[PDB]
Amino acid sequence: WAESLIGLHLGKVALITGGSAGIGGQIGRLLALSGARVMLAARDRHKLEQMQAMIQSELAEVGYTDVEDRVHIAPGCDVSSEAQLADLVERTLSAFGTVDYLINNAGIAGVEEMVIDMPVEGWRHTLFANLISNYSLMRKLAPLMKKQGSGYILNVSSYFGGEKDAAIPYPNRADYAVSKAGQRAMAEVFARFLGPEIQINAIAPGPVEGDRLRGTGERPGLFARRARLILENKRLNELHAALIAAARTDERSMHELVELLLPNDVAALEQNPAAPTALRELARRFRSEGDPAASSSSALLNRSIAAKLLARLHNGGYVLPADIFANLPNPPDPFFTRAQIDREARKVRDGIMGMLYLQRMPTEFDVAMATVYYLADRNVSGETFHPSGGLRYERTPTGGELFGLPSPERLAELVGSTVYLIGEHLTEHLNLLARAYLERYGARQVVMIVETETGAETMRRLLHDHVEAGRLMTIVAGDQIEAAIDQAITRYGRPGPVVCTPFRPLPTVPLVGRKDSDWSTVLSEAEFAELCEHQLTHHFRVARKIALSDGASLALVTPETTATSTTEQFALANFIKTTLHAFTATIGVESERTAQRILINQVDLTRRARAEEPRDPHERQQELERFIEAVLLVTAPLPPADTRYAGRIHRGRAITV
Amino acid sequence: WAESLIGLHLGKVALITGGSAGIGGQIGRLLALSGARVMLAARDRHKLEQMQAMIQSELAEVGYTDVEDRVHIAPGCDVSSEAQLADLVERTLSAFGTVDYLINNAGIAGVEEMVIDMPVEGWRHTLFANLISNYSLMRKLAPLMKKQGSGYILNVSSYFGGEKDAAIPYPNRADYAVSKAGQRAMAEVFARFLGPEIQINAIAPGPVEGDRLRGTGERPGLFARRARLILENKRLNELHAALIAAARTDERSMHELVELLLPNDVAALEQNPAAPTALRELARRFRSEGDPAASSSSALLNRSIAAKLLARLHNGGYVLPADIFANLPNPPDPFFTRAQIDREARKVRDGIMGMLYLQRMPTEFDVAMATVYYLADRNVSGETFHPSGGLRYERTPTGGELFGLPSPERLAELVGSTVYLIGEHLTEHLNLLARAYLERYGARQVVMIVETETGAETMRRLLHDHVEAGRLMTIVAGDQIEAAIDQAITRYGRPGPVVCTPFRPLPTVPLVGRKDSDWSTVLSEAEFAELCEHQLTHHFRVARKIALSDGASLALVTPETTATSTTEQFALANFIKTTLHAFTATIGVESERTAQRILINQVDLTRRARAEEPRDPHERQQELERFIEAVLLVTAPLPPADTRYAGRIHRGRAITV
Ligand SMILES: NC(=O)c1ccc[n+]([C@@H]2O[C@H](COP(=O)([O-])OP(=O)(O)OC[C@H]3O[C@@H](n4cnc5c(N)ncnc54)[C@H](OP(=O)(O)O)[C@@H]3O)[C@@H](O)[C@H]2O)c1
Ligand SMILES: NC(=O)c1ccc[n+]([C@@H]2O[C@H](COP(=O)([O-])OP(=O)(O)OC[C@H]3O[C@@H](n4cnc5c(N)ncnc54)[C@H](OP(=O)(O)O)[C@@H]3O)[C@@H](O)[C@H]2O)c1
Ligand SMILES: [Mg+2]
Ligand SMILES: [Mg+2]
């Protein structure tokens, strides 16, 4: 079977992160069999030593000599640590000299929670491990590849990272999906800069068979575990959606509404004539859709769900004592029966298996073999190769640019609304949006949330008339956007429409260095992490907070490109646009599937090419009016027109101005 | 170099169309070296005999014996002929038994004209050779592959066939682009039906180095030839656009306007105070942008351009004597100078080369090698592999579904307009559109162009009130849509907005047969050709005619899918939607680049999945209103808002209802 492989990559040096097991371990193995000298990097020394010994033994069997010189290991390497990545590159260059192939394979599953239950630090950790690490290693190795006149960067993405003009929603995995999309977008935008010397591509396998305790989660894996979590999350979502909806139209505070749940009795809540209709209807559903042997059919929640529900409420700025659930009656085991858990387990498994046109799961070996043959192709760059595929799954096309205003019925919903606008750099866009909502569509007030005092003063001077009239309020957020939103909620009330623009402009630094330069001026590893903080994490933090705070709609706005933006700014803007589409699509589907009201969509001020941009003041006026129209199209709330069909249309989409 | 290849496909039987030269010849060569028995099909016997001898000689050199049994040829096989495809399959099965790999490689360049200069029979020929032939061979070979439990269909598409959610405009190549997109769409929609036994994928290489006299045109090729044609076409486009525009706002007939060109004197036309401003301004441009040594700077046209211009005018229903240009003064050679031709030649070459990130053209051998390694992958189906790529080129994202109505300024342009509606099956959509234009937006009249008398009577009964009032006229087109449009032009006047819906519904027949069946009920080769005639050729014929007839806008409407459409209807609808997007994007760019006024866009009534469809009368009412909004968004003309920026936005787009 190895006949076709031996000699294919003779003379090459390859660095494989996550190289002791899974797909990475097989790519390392097969590259070594093909003749490459390999460095395997991962955290655990023992697993690396086992893999190294297995590969060296196989190399000796096929005839290689001095096998200790062909397979090296780099233990204690966690790709989320910049210092560990710097050490890995020094160790690899010391062992083998210049790296020919950088195989950016290591990937972690991430937080595995809905955005509204996702810690911000958890999101950041996934980006550091899965995405920022890929830029970091490219930044350290590409100078030597360019100098020698050849190199290859391969980012191991996922089918769930999407494709060129479409996002793929991956509910409960937004951090992961964004990291995967970012890996592909990095190949797409850097290819022109890295060429002709260096190829950069991504692989996007679908689910791959492997160790049930490991992997990034595309494969079925652990069933009873995945199922029980799904059932616990479903109970949390149903309770949270009913309490949020009840609070919106009931005179009682969230504290008073949560007090209705304290007897923890489903039948008593359904039968309570004074309980809000959303809670009584929910209790009816728990009794009907429930297994009579499961205590979840007679009890509303348990201590674990209650704590996670309380965390959502506190994070949404609702006021409740921390000990509100201290005396909650504990429901008897089983909360969910074995039958319920096994039914959900079969649903998870069959769902994944049912996507496959070929009705067979590829192996890690199969995926690695297709990848190692693909590496021999010298005529591809900026591509995403699918070593496995043939999947039936939902897709969200991105980049539509032909649109108009929403219906007068949708625009009528804006009268007397509380609008939040977030931004700093885009003063023209912010001024025009505040004026459109206040002057044209009768919003009651606009809360302008900026980053700095200088930004606040600039907006206050631009909107002096609305400031004086008490229609425009300004808040300075700094790096504490969630606390700034809590200030807005307490002082000015909860938002209806929200528009989120980035605080910062894109940097103007080179993306590659000259062949004989030290690359000292090129976008640094720290600067790439800052780009992700300002252009991706910013939107995630706002979306998480606004959804938790019962915002009606949210428009995520990407950076602006113009006819005079630098070529590097166009590349970075397109990297952000593609990567954020993964977030928008995923959170849109999460929201829709969990009966959350919020409509979340993306409005792009970034275009693929300079030639598409306005060239004169007339075309610029047309562009700014298109921006206002795009934002109103995604922020005007659906009138009580609110169907399942209309609901799916108005969430997780991206439109280009 | 062959070490990695020998044995990879041992025991396989492969059929390669266009197998005597180019990419196909190399795929045949490398599959044979890898151990497959190959059948090479093409038209010329001599080139097939040369290729067969070269491959057999190379097989003997590497150690194969009885090489005459491993490489067979099938001369006189033109893939555009159904009878020749039937003979090819009988010859291959007689030689080798069951085919394992069907390599649908043969492709012709096609007409190589703008849509408005493209003969309808030429378009049909390209579809037969490049697309219908692929279905035909799959239909003949898949029953035996399913029976044996394995098979592979590979369609050789092009980067210019587009990708999953994006079309790629290919001006002057619409027939070719549609055929290439259709090959990819066939892999995308048939994969679920052909699985698990059969894999179906496409390859989409970018430009490939080859014989300058051959190939499908992605590579630079012949320069002085490509350039002189571009210059001749540019003169034709500029003259045609100026005459069409002048005729629209001048009291003189097209005959009288063309008489201004008969002295064939640029300076005299510019200096004529009675000549329309569009013609005087054009003559000024010919004098300024022209080479003084070129007779095209002092003469408007030559006999060749004049005949092609007269053909456009006659095909647009303008009345002119066939001998109008019989006495045209012949301009002295050179009409275009060597300097002008060489400048354009360098532009063509540099344009193609400048797209490549790797600044190197892949060879046929390189592309075939990557393809033969890819064929070993058993875990992919419905995919498009790019064996070469890394290209900078324009892309048109498709499938946007969040939109609203156009501006009141655009809708005001519809008052007193002449609307043409084309269709038959979609009576509800046709009735609602005629009523929207007449009752809501004050169109003067609607011309309803149907296929049959029964269709006409159905529409006349649905629209009885507008029929009686003389606001709704009905014409029966049959299979003569162009003559039907000429009747509408003569009797009712030239159209402003035009909506083109398919006359026919999609068929309800199986797309695959049972393993042990004869497949007698499965979609036949003739039925697949009929599907292309009714769902692709229909729109091309209407777009070609309407653009030539000075229509203001055109909406191409795809088939309707509902919550109750069969699974085969969903597959066929999606095949059409993807394939027609290639046409819409290409003609939109052709029109924009040649200063044609017409706005051409696509409105899709097809969705990817059943779960997205309306489920009740309320959601169905929402869907039909969305259809009207989509059509008005693409058909309301741009008010004298008509800029270069707005122009590019409003052409070649596709929106999903
Ligand atoms: N599994 C799938 O079905 C699938 C599908 C599509 C794409 N992918 C992608 O394929 C890649 C590999 O996935 P996998 O399923 O093989 O993963 P895996 O089974 O979890 O891990 C394989 C290797 O990664 C190492 N690793 C884990 N976390 C690490 C970290 N923080 N830093 C460094 N090394 C780390 C492990 O060693 P240590 O634990 O000792 O560090 C081991 O060597 C990922 O990028 C993933 O997104 C996977
Ligand atoms: N050339 C490129 O840069 C490029 C790029 C992307 C995709 N492609 C695709 O690659 C495929 C092969 O293209 P190519 O450039 O190799 O083409 P090519 O050079 O024109 O032709 C190669 C072979 O096709 C045969 N052939 C031509 N017309 C035929 C017909 N009507 N019926 C049967 N055989 C026919 C030729 O033999 P006879 O003339 O004797 O029949 C010869 O064997 C096509 O599908 C094309 O669309 C090409
Ligand atoms: Mg711009
Ligand atoms: Mg429908």
TrEMBL record, chains A, B:
Binding site for Mg(2+) 1: 247, 250
UniProt keyword annotation of Calcium present: no
Stretch forming the signal peptide: none
Molecular function (Gene Ontology), one example: nucleotide binding
Domain of life: Bacteria
GO BP term, example: fatty acid elongation
Record-listed Mg(2+) 2 binding positions: 561, 613, 623
Keyword list, A-Z: Metal-binding, Nucleotide-binding, Oxidoreductase
Annotated binding of NADP(+), by residue: 18, 20-21, 23, 43-44, 47, 78-79, 105, 176, 180, 208, 212, 214-215
Residues that hold Mg(2+) 3 according to the record: 591, 596
UniProt KW Glycosyltransferase keyword: no
UniProt record similarity statement: Belongs to the short-chain dehydrogenases/reductases (SDR) family.
Name of the protein in question: Short-chain dehydrogenase/reductase SDR
Source organism: Chloroflexus aurantiacus (strain ATCC 29366 / DSM 635 / J-10-fl)
Shown residues in whole-protein numbering: 562 to 1219 of 1219
